Design a binder for this molecule. Structure first.
Ligand SMILES: C[C@@H](O)[C@@H](CO)Nc1c(C(N)=O)cnn2cc(-c3ccccc3)cc12
Length: 277
């Protein structure tokens, strides 16, 4: 739960993100390269707003205990970093592109169901993730995934079901694009895009970005966000991925209901994904 900084041996960057970075370190108290590998997060920017954002991420993660959520290990003490478990398989986005040929629909439905049970748990703790995407989901093993990257996560006050607040715009809900409103229902919208990513095996050529920019075309002077929003308000959606089982695509469309109230809950989605297998 307390890691001495002098015992955290740097290996490489996993990071690939703004404001903060995640490094692969070996917790090597014996100094012989035999200790367990850990994923260590730190904020590259200092100040009295980023440090508040960093303490909040620590507090949120420390209090989360689920098989489908990256495990908190502790914090570091030195002459402050967040210490979590390291998943050598890495993000689901890259895993799906490397192992495409052996991952069938039942396997993708198993990952979908696991992500869903993780989000149900997040909702129960009043946590809005705000950054649900395949790049933020980690592969624990062949048949097990976990939700990671809690850098944008916010706790919903007891008397509110939403929150009013830089990621690719193709994962946001219309209400987040228009009024910066975030809730468990906008995490459901994002989940719909995760199902799309999974059933495309995160192929870059039919990625939410490639497919939406292709559909948006090119507006005369209208900004791209406004364009995406006009496309979404019009009822236009990402097309069924190639060879996608029809029922999966119907589930995506429900996650993509225009109004937050009409979107299914994670609790409602779970049995539906389990039934499909
Ligand atoms: C989801 C992101 O927050 C990512 C950091 O980019 N986080 C990783 C973590 C973590 N605990 O956040 C753990 N293992 N973990 C393993 C990898 C990784 C990345 C590339 C290749 C292999 C492993 C990345 C992570």
């Amino acid at each position: 739960t307390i890691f001495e900084e002098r015992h955290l041996k740097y290996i490489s960057q996993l990071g690939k993100g703004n404001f903060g970075s995640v490094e692969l370190c070996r917790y090597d108290p014996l100094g012989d390269n035999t200790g367990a590998l850990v994923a260590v997060k730190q904020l590259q920017h200092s100040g009295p707003d980023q440090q508040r954002d960093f303490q909040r991420e620590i507090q949120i993660l420390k209090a989360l205990h689920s098989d489908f959520i990256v495990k908190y290990r502790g914090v570091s003490y030195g002459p402050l970093r967040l210490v979590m478990e390291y998943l050598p398989s890495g993000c689901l986005r890259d895993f799906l592109q490397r192992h495409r040929a052996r991952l069938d629909a039942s396997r993708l439905l198993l990952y979908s169901s696991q992500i869903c049970k993780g989000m149900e748990y997040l909702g129960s703790r009043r946590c809005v993730h705000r950054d649900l995407a395949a790049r933020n989901i980690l592969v624990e093993s062949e048949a097990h995934v976990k939700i990671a990257d809690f850098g944008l996560a916010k706790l919903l006050p007891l008397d509110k079901d939403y929150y009013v607040v830089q990621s690719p715009i193709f994962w946001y809900a219309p209400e987040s694009l228009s009024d910066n409103i975030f809730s468990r229902q906008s995490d459901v919208w994002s989940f719909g895009v995760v199902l799309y990513e999974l059933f495309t095996y995160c192929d870059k050529s039919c990625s939410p970005s490639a497919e939406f920019l292709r559909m948006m075309g090119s507006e005369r002077d209208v900004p791209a966000l406004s364009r995406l929003l006009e496309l979404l308000e019009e009822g236009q959606r990402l097309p069924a991925p190639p060879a996608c089982p029809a029922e999966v695509h119907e589930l995506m469309k429900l996650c993509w209901a225009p109004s937050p109230q009409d979107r299914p809950s994670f609790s409602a989605l779970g049995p539906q994904l389990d039934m499909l297998w």
